């Protein structure tokens, strides 16, 4: 952690099924052919580690 927030650590938030790709996650029934947006999510989510947590 650091004063301005340490955001260098990622975790996977979305995946098709249970267990390092960045393929856009299709939440809906509409194919996500390269563009992220509604029901097309980037699969990774950053942590917000701060000295104040």
């Amino acid at each position, epitope marked *: 952690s650091k004063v*301005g927030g340490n*955001y260098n650590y990622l975790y996977r938030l979305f995946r098709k099924s249970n267990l390092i790709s960045t393929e856009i996650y299709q939440a809906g029934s509409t194919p996500c052919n390269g563009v*992220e*947006g509604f029901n097309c999510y980037f699969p990774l989510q950053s942590y917000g580690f701060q000295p104040t947590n």
Partner: antibody
Amino acid sequence: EVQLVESGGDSVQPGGSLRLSCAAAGFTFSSYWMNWVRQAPGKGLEWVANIKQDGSEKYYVDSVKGRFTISRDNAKNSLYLQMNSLRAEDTAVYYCALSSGYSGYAGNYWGQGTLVTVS
Amino acid sequence: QAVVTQEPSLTVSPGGTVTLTCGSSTGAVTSGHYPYWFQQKPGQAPRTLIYDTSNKHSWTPARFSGSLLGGKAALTLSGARPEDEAEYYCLLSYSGARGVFGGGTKLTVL
């Protein structure tokens, strides 16, 4: 990657007309909404116009009502914005934007922008 | 109608937080206005950071967040960096697809 490339901007005479165009690549065109934005130099972004995913509906900011027309050709993966009675006041960089959001009113992916100068 | 207000400018020391705000002239900001936030550096096309109130794009630094305050939208930075100097714009939807941009809030780093 996902890209939008707009052009057609030029130095034109006021009172005349100008047709701008945007070519899309890297994604399926017929899946999303297309948005237009203009930015006058020294000013922030304004909103100009939109169009429905299937082309059945168009939408505009009141300031361009009756003056701007939007249509697209999904066979060419491109859209057009044509404006009549183009004003000298309307000097701006026009941007092509792709809207993949929930309501489809605002773009997520933006082109580099084409400069429209009227004189 | 098309009146969206923002604080004209903010100045924040590196590592400090920044709160940018955005509100309409009528009612209050809700998820129904699907608010957007953009960041524009001089000489460049604007980059979208936040969409549909709080969703972040893959190119959006995790430092930014689309929280809501007392009936108005905000964009909060968890730790300002020199790379964040830009004009930020907010965009609100209304009764239809006629978005209105805010005047813009210039954010600089001390």
